[PDB]
Amino acid sequence: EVTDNNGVKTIANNLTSTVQVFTDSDYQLPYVLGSAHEGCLPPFPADVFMIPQYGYLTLNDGSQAVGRSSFYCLEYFPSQMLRTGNNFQFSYEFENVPFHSSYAH
């Protein structure tokens, strides 16, 4: 918890607050990975990174929406709640992809 008293930043930890996590495992959210976005885990293990903000685009008539435009409340999914003693584990099996050709002819 960060507090601002007279322009002074004091950071205290809030032991009872939670963080919500879920994996969109049924693929029912717009998928924004796969657009080559600058928000990833840093190449160097000793770096600390900010988590990028999630957002999506739907059908637009210029700047306007249309009837087919879909809105997603992410709080409508079941999430896991974590307060500082909790951890989150996720396992995934890749589908059968071909080997990437790591050679020249």
Partner 1 sequence: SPLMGGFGMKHPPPQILIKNTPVPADPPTAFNKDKLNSFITQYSTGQVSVEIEWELQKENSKRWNPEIQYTSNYYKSNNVEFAVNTEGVYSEPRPIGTRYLTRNL
Residue 54 as a binder of partner 1 (CB under 8 A): the answer is: no
Q: Which one of residues 69, 83, 86, 88 is an interface residue with partner 1 (CB under 8 A)? A: 69
Which residue, 71 or 90, is less far from partner 1 as judged by CB?
Answer: 71
Q: Which one of residues 44, 49, 71, 92 is an interface residue with partner 1 (CB under 8 A)? A: 71
Tokens of residue 90, six digits? 């996720």
For residues 66 and 60, the answer to whether their CB atoms sit within 8 Å is yes
Rounded least distance, CB 34 to partner 1, Å: 12
Distance from the Cα of residue 36 to its chain's centroid: 14
Residue 64 as a binder of partner 1 (CB under 8 A): the answer is: no
- Beta-carbon-side half-sphere exposure of residue 54 (alpha carbons within 13 Å): 11
For residues 74 and 29, the answer to whether their CB atoms sit within 8 Å is yes
**Interface positions with partner 1 (CB under 8 A):** 28, 30, 67-73, 76-77
